[PDB]
Design a protein around this ligand. Structure first.
Ligand SMILES: CNc1nc(NC)c2ncn(C)c2n1
Ligand SMILES: [Cl-]
Length: 149
């Protein structure tokens, strides 16, 4: 429980929502990801402003699944000019590296009581893709996911 993410000063944490589980599986296999155009720009700015002084974490969830499916750290800036059609749909353009840390399904029931003060106090489980999570709430989510059994 407190073994995980006890030292996570600095850094920023985002929700990732996918409408394709196959895309997630490919992310886990090859340690890469891509968001929407606006989502890519958000993650890119966060990663770049962090300038390596802390981690950028990604909380992954397949839309409609009722569970989060793991955690990865973002590991490069966004390359916007990359091979087309590598994902479930052609609209996913560009690429950045990640490193997956946890691959595990955690029911939303374990997380829905955490609310985002930056998103009208909505449960963290009702977030859209690349919703940023306040650090103290992110620390709570990461610990729950890490320790869930
Ligand atoms: C439909 N598959 C899919 N793939 C993504 N990245 C490759 C993604 N990022 C945000 N959403 C909603 C996404 N959906
Ligand atoms: Cl590629």
């Amino acid at each position: 429980e407190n073994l995980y993410f006890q030292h996570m000063k600095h850094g920023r944490v985002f929700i990732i929502k996918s409408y394709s589980e196959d895309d997630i599986h490919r992310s886990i296999k090859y340690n890469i990801w891509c968001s929407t155009e606006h989502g890519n720009k958000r993650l890119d700015a966060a990663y770049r402003s962090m300038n390596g002084k802390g981690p950028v974490y990604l909380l992954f969830s397949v839309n409609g699944s009722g569970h989060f499916c793991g955690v990865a750290e973002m590991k490069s800036a966004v390359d916007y000019n990359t091979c087309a059609g590598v994902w479930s749909q052609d609209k996913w353009k560009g690429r950045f590296d990640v490193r997956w840390i946890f691959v595990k399904d955690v029911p939303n029931s374990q997380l829905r009581h955490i609310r985002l003060e930056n998103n009208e106090n909505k449960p963290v489980t009702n977030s859209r893709d690349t919703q940023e999570v306040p650090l103290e709430k992110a620390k709570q989510v990461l610990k729950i996911i890490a320790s869930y059994k």
